């Protein structure tokens, strides 16, 4: 599916296990809260591929319309109910443009039935597709009400919806007020920012490739440490990974200081950290080779 090399640590393994257990749960919807670039949609894609679920994304663009969202919802509901396909519906909060998106998402998460989505010719097409699906499954159903009930049961069994949004107190209050199914019919998982242990593990995993061991390295008595449970005394690799972690943390502190002063602020992310360690590896290799 994706040629993106991921890095493993305890938080990644635990998050993958939680996402897998909720996918195994029937009518199981996620709500992943965490900073952007922390790897929520890629973990969801990987777990859906492991479980055989087909990842479906809105693929929003400019000049998007509530009618276009209705069409995407119709396609995913048809695939999940008539064709009997397990779909992992990944939906970031950036895909929400107005309340027309989120009211329909609320109804879909809470019931599995969205009245008014299929009307007229679309309703007739859905009914004949459900009749074909009932013929394929062997169940014989007469008239439309039990066909729609069977379709609702099928989409309840099949569809899984995963949300991905950044943490915010006011945003969470707004979402809890305007969309209760995110807080009642969705399992919440506060991924958050990468912890100090996760940053240390990622830095050590990338650093282990390149050789920088210094036998004649003197450990100072002070050793300002930012990651707890650091091995004392630390080696050169441990010292520089602690230094990388401190670099990320002091970027957080400087950004907070700038925001408190009143200047514009920018998000600092695990993507920034991976970028920094990749730059470190490439620059170290190039400089050592050329010298």
């Amino acid at each position: 599916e994706l040629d993106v090399p991921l890095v493993l640590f305890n938080e990644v393994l635990d998050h993958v296990l939680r996402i897998d257990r909720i996918f195994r749960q029937p009518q199981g919807h996620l709500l992943l809260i965490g900073v952007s670039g922390a790897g929520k949609t890629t973990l969801s894609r990987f777990v859906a591929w492991m479980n055989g679920l087909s990842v479906y994304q809105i693929k929003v663009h400019r000049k998007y319309t509530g009618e276009d969202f209705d069409e995407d919802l119709r396609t995913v509901l048809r695939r999940s109910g008539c064709k009997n396909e397990k779909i992992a519906f990944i939906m970031d909060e950036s895909n929400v443009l107005d309340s027309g998106f989120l009211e329909r998402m609320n109804t879909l998460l809470a019931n599995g039935e969205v009245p008014g989505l299929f009307e007229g010719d679309e309703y007739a097409t859905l009914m004949t597709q459900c009749k074909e699906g009932a013929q394929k499954e062997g169940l014989m159903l007469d008239s439309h009400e039990e066909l729609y009930k069977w379709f609702t049961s099928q989409v309840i069994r099949n569809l899984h919806v995963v949300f991905t949004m950044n943490p915010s107190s006011e945003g969470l209050k707004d979402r809890a007020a305007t969309s209760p199914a995110l807080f009642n019919r969705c399992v919440l998982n506060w991924f958050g920012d990468w912890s100090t242990e996760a940053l240390y593990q990622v830095g050590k995993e990338f650093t282990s490739k390149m050789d920088l061991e210094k036998p004649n390295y003197i450990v100072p008595d002070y050793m300002p440490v930012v990651y707890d449970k650091l091995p004392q005394p630390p080696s050169h690799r441990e010292a520089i990974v602690n230094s990388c972690v401190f670099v990320h943390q002091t970027l957080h502190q400087a950004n907070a200081r700038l925001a408190k002063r009143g200047g514009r602020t920018m998000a600092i992310t695990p993507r920034h950290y991976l970028d920094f360690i990749n730059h470190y590896a490439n620059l170290f290799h190039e400089k050592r080779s050329e010298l």
């Binding site: 994706l2 230094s243 990388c244 400087a254 514009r264 600092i268 993507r271 470190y280 170290f284």
Partner: protein, 860 residues
């Protein structure tokens, strides 16, 4: 030369020790210090270096990030491809070359975009925009083919770029696949993309902030000083500048020759492959290389003329570049006290180009030309900046310019007393301390206690107790004009500062007048004097406004500049297209009219455009991407509204339309508005009537300013009322006079005019009975003149030994002469108000000026 080769090659262990730390520092800088400015970049680097030092990780302290991460040939290629010589610009180019995530470029100037265009010019760049409808076709063409892509206007970001930025790539077989939308596109390896925005004040969502890396092209003080030095070299010594430019190019080419020669020598000595003495070709090549090393040795004459050029340009034009950098950074930090006016580097450079070249009375003497340039730079900067700023903040900007002039010029730095003047008012006082309240009061006693912290004011309580006869500075009159007492010879500027501190401690209501006196003593008496006259709109539009910059005309509520622009177009005989923004057909008509006016060269005016900010952003983008006629001006009429986009505010030229300050300025504005042909018509009493109208209008408008004593509620007495009044006066004078050159003061319909003003013209807005009675008694006082009695009194200025007499003139020329020679001082008793009306207002304005200056200084 092996005596140098051995030293070069005997640092292997030291470089192995330092390489890990130095690579860590450089990688952290490249990855994290992209969005920040120079100060935060340096702060982050210092913090990282301090952490490495206290963790005992070896790194090279005496290194430069630009020199470590960039080669000399690479840097020369960069400045060949249109890049500024800034260290910050070089760092930005390093990020743009070694990016891992695709870059986002922030630059209002466009120099970064031009540099990218020149650098990736060997490859083919298409320059599209995120708001181009056919953007996906260009993106997929670049993806399939392998072309660099530069897309501007990131604010309308297209989330179809998300898999491209995230590198969500499939590697089925030997091909490389990325899936955008429904189509599957083969991804070529030689594809890069650059996102570009043209404003620093923009908010990006956190997902985009994660998936892109930022490169901020901010302006540095050193870069601005270099630019101003080069420009003054252009404007003063063109031959010297030409010599310097050819010199820099020649030196760069010869340094490239040095690098090539050293590389060739080392590669030949490494690839000799046998015995060097076996073949004479190696010896001959080394002889040629040594002859070129000899010309490298004789480079010393070029280095000598380098030093002579640097020393003469420094010793002449050192303190002008620093002054210009201070001016620009003052007007850049000015944006955070009113958030209406935003000024661009292009705006400051236009001011500097105006003062450098088109200066009247500027000679052929380099001794005096620098002083003339500096003084006119200060004055022109004040004029062009404060024409689009509030009369509250005029004095603040003037005093900041005075501080810049004082720092530039002799006079020592009065930092201690300036810090006490700005911040020292909030210092903690002694517990349970109270001086004598025999002549002073408690608040000014506490102020004197605070002021006594200065060494010069060691004895203040004893001095004011001994000087009991100095009741003039204690109360009444104008203490600023005559400030007794004192803080070694005393410079006039230091005396002004000490007296300003005394006034701030004793009587804060004279702070504005004393700040005006300080500005007058520091820069000239006639510094602020150009802001009393009506704005020279015809000259400014004709000369000081480029066609592609819209003429933003912001007005406080109650005032509108549409009549001013229409009158300007009528008097210059230029046809105009007035469109009132606020409809879909209005937007379509605005687009069509602006296109036709750009192609042809007419004038276009769009009114009330503060109601459509989303369309204002698109208009700003179109005006930036547009190339207009030579004589074309776009007028945008707005209101003081925080919904006006910062993009349009920076792109345009702001003219704040404000209530005219003072009766004299109000009369001058009224007389300039009323045409001379209209006011000079028969009979001869029309001039008297128009002067009475102008005086009445000025008095009631200034009374409106002094609320709620002047009027119970803030009415809007304006130019519509004045024009209707003039029309009624003209009609009644024509009715009562049929071709008569002179009309006796008894036959004129004074009562008819008075009751028509009382009922219809000015009394329409008035609803309160007491306000109506006040208007009626002003009309009765003014519109009888005791039958045009000589030495008639319009009002009384001061109740003690002062009065205002109406002139005995007959012609508009001598009336406006009397108005011009009216005294510059004003008192609320001119209007008929109590003398204590303005005290609280002046105190509040003074403390607000102090707060604004303190905020700008603290955030500086």
């Amino acid at each position: 030369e092996r005596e140098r080769w051995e030293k070069t090659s005997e640092t292997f262990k030291n470089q192995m020790s330092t390489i890990a730390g130095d690579c860590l520092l450089s990688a952290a800088f490249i990855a994290y210090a992209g969005y920040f400015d120079q100060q935060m970049r340096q702060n982050l680097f210092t913090t990282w270096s301090h952490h490495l030092q206290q963790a005992n990780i070896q790194f090279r302290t005496d290194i430069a990030r630009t020199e470590y991460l960039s080669n000399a040939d690479e840097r020369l290629r960069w400045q060949a491809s249109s890049l500024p010589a800034d260290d910050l610009c070089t760092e930005n180019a390093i990020m743009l070359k070694r990016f891992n995530r695709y870059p986002l470029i922030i630059d209002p100037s466009g120099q970064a975009t031009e540099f990218i265009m020149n650098e990736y010019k060997d490859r083919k760049i298409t320059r599209t925009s995120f708001l181009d409808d056919a953007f996906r076709k260009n993106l997929e063409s670049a993806l399939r083919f392998g072309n660099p892509l530069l897309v501007q206007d990131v604010e309308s970001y297209d989330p179809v770029l998300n898999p491209v930025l995230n590198r969500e790539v499939r590697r089925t077989g030997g091909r490389v696949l990325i899936t955008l939308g429904d189509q599957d596109i083969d991804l070529s390896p030689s594809f890069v993309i650059f996102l570009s925005t043209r404003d620093p004040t923009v908010e990006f969502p956190p997902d985009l902030c994660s998936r892109v890396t930022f490169v901020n092209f901010t302006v540095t003080r050193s870069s601005l000083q270099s630019q101003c030095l080069n420009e003054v070299l252009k404007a003063e010594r063109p031959d010297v500048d030409e010599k310097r430019s050819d010199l820099l190019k020649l030196q760069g080419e010869f340094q490239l020759r040095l690098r090539q020669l050293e590389k060739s020598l080392l590669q030949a000595l490494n690839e000799v492959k046998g015995r060097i003495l076996d073949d004479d070709t190696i010896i001959t090549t080394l002889e040629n290389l040594k002859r070129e090393a000899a010309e490298v040795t004789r480079k010393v004459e070029e280095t000598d003329i380098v030093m002579q050029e640097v020393e003469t340009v420094s010793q002449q034009y050192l303190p002008l570049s620093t002054a210009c950098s201070s001016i620009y950074f003052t007007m850049e930090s000015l944006k955070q006290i009113h958030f209406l006016y935003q000024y661009s580097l292009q705006f400051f450079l236009d001011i500097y180009h105006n003062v450098l070249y088109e200066n009247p009375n500027l000679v052929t003497d380099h001794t005096q030309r620098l002083s003339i340039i500096t003084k006119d730079l200060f004055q022109v900067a004040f004029n062009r900046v404060a024409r689009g700023m509030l009369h509250q903040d005029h004095i603040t900007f003037a005093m900041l310019l005075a501080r810049i002039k004082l720092k530039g010029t002799g006079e020592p730095t009065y930092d201690a007393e300036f810090q006490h003047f700005l911040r020292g008012n909030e210092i903690v006082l002694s517990a349970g301390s109270t001086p004598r309240i025999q002549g002073l009061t408690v608040e000014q006693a506490e102020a004197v206690v605070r002021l006594s912290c200065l060494p010069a004011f060691k004895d203040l309580i004893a001095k004011v107790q001994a000087d009991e006869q100095f009741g003039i500075w204690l109360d009444s009159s104008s203490p600023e004009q005559t400030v007794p007492y004192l803080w070694t010879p005393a410079t006039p500027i230091g005396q002004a500062i000490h007296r300003l501190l005394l006034i701030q401690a004793f009587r804060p209501d004279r702070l504005l007048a004393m700040a005006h006196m300080f500005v007058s003593t520091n820069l000239g008496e006639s510094f602020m004097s150009i802001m009393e006259q009506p704005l020279d709109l015809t000259h400014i539009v004709g000369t000081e406004v480029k066609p592609n910059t819209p003429v933003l005309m912001c007005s406080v509520p109650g005032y509108d500049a549409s009549g001013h622009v229409e009158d300007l177009a009528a008097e210059q005989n230029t046809q105009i297209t007035s469109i009132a923004i606020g409809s879909a057909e209005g937007f379509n008509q605005a687009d069509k009219a602006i296109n036709t006016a750009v192609k042809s060269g007419r004038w276009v005016m769009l009114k009330n455009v503060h109601l459509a900010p989303g369309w204002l952003m698109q208009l700003e983008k179109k005006l930036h991407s547009l190339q207009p006629h030579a004589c074309f001006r776009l007028f945008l009429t707005m209101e003081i509204n925080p919904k006006v986009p910062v993009n349009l505010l920076r792109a345009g030229r702001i003219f704040v339309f404000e209530p005219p300050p003072g009766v004299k300025a109000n009369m001058l504005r009224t007389f300039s508005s009323i045409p001379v042909s209209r006011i000079c018509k028969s009979p001869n009493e029309r001039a008297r009537l128009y002067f009475l109208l102008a005086w009445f209008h000025a008095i009631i408008q200034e009374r409106l300013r002094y609320a709620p004593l002047g009027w119970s509620k803030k009415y809007e007495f304006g130019e519509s009322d004045l024009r209707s009044a003039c029309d009624t006066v003209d009609t009644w004078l024509d009715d009562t006079a049929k071709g008569r050159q002179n009309i006796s003061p008894d036959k004129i319909p004074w009562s008819a005019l008075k009751t028509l003003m009382a009922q219809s013209i000015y009394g329409g807005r008035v609803d309160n009975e007491f306000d109506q009675r006040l208007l009626n008694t002003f009309l009765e006082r003014l519109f009888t003149t005791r039958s045009f009695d000589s030495e008639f009194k319009l009002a009384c200025k001061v109740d003690g030994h002062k009065d205002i007499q109406m002139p005995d003139g007959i012609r508009r020329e001598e009336f406006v002469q009397w108005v011009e020679l009216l005294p510059d001082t004003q008192t609320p008793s001119w209007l008929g108000l109590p003398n204590n009306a303005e005290r609280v207002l002046l105190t509040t304005q003074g403390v607000d000026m102090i707060s604004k200056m303190l905020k700008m200084q603290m955030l500086e």
